[PDB]
From a paper:
The major pathological hallmark of AD is the accumulation and deposition of amyloid-beta (Aβ) peptides (amyloid plaques) outside neurons, followed by the formation of intra-neuronal tangles of the protein Tau, the loss of synaptic function, neuronal death, and irreversible damage of the brain tissue. We investigated Aβ40 fibrils formed from this monomeric Aβ40 in the presence of negatively charged liposomes composed of 1,2-dimyristoyl-sn-glycero-3-phosphoglycerol (DMPG) by magic-angle sample spinning NMR spectroscopy and cryo-EM. Here we present the cryo-electron microscopy (cryo-EM) structures of six lipidic Aβ40 fibrils that assemble from three filament folds, providing structural insights into fibril–lipid interactions. Indeed, the three lipidic Aβ folds are identical in the central β-strand formed by residues Q15 to A21, with only minor differences in the sidechain rotamers, but they differ in the conformation of the N- and C-termini.
The L1 fibril, which is most populated in the cryo-EM dataset, is composed of two intertwined protofilaments of the same fold, related by an approximate pseudo 21 screw symmetry. The high-resolution cryo-EM map allows us to accurately model residues D1-V40. L1 is also dominant in the NMR spectrum (vide infra). Following NMR assignments for 37 residues, NOE data revealed contacts between the phospholipid acyl chains and residues D23 to G33, the hydrophobic residues L34 and M35 as well as part of the N-terminal β-strand (K16-V18), identifying the additional density in the cryo-EM map of L1 as lipids. Furthermore, we observed additional interactions with the acyl chain (Q15-F19) and the head group (D1-H13) of liposomes in the L1 fibril. Indeed, hydrophobic surface patches are formed by the L1 structure that faces the hydrophobic acyl chains of the lipid molecules. In the case of L1, extra density is located between Lys28 and Val40, extending over 3.3 nm, corresponding to the combined length of two acyl chains in a DMPG lipid molecule. In contrast, the C-terminus in the L1 fibril adopts an extended conformation in which K28 interacts with E22 and D23. The L1 fibril also reveals a compact N-terminus due to inter-protofilament interactions mediated by V40. During molecular dynamics simulations of the L1 fibril, we observed that the hydrogen bond between D23 and K28 breaks but also reforms, with the hydrogen bond being present in 52 ± 1% of all conformations, in agreement with the peak doubling in the NMR experiments. Furthermore, such interactions are present in the lipidic L1 fibril and in both ex vivo Aβ42 fibrils, supporting the disease relevance of the lipidic fibril L1.
Residue numbers in the entry:
A (entry chain A), B (entry chain C), C (entry chain E), D (entry chain G), E (entry chain I), F (entry chain J), ...: 1 to 40
The structure:
């Protein structure tokens, strides 16, 4: 008379999660508000 | 008289999740608000 | 007299999820609000 | 007298999901609000 | 006297889903609001 | 013996120029690359 | 014996120029690359 | 014996120039690369 | 015997220039690379 | 025998220049690279 229940609400085996964020709100280039040249 | 229930609400085996975000709201190029040249 | 139930509400085996977002709201090119040249 | 039920509400085996988004709301080209040249 | 039910509400085997979105609301070309040249 | 020449190559009096561009390459509505719902 | 020449190459009096660009390459609405819902 | 030349190459009187750019490459709305919901 | 030349190469009187750029490459709204919800 | 030349190469009287740049490459809204919720 055995029972053997395995009711683990969440069972996870060999899970591999990678969350990668790169370059979020980053500036790798020029941002210039104004360029003014040769103004008389 | 065995039972053997395995009622794990969520059972996950060998899951591999990759969430990749790149270049979200990023500027890799020029943003210039104004260029003004040769103004007299 | 065996039973052998396997009622896991969610059963996942060997799932591979890739969520990839690239270049979302990103500027890789020039954005210029105004270019003004040769104005007298 | 066996039973052998396998009523997992969701059963997934060897699923591979790829969600790819690229270039969503991204500018890879020039956007210029105005170009004004040779104005007297 | 066996039973052998397999009533998994959703059963998925070897599913491969690819959702690909590219170039959604993206500008790879020039957008110029105005070009004005040679105005006197 | 008067002369009174007025040879101005370009003579402009009381000119009013309005160049208006609105909504050029602009999205005021939804753009969705894919909607997928209820897929099994 | 007067002369009175007025040969100004470009003569401009009371010129009013308005160059207006609004909403050039701008998104005021939603852009979604993918919406995926209820996928099993 | 007067002369009275007024050969100014460019003569400008009472010029009013307004260059306005608004909302050039700007996002005032949502841009979402992916929305994924209810995926099993 | 007067002369009275006024050959100023560029003559500007009462010029008013307004260059306004607003919201150039600016985000006033949400940009989300991915939203993932309810994934098992 | 007067002369009275006024050949100033650039002559500017009562010029008013306003160059205004606001919100150039600025984020006033949320940018989120990923939101992941309810992942098992």
């Amino acid at each position: 008379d055995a029972e053997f229940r395995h009711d683990s609400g969440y069972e996870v085996h060999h899970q591999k999660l990678v969350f990668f964020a790169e370059d979020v709100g980053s500036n790798k280039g020029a941002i210039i508000g104004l360029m003014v040249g040769g103004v008389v």
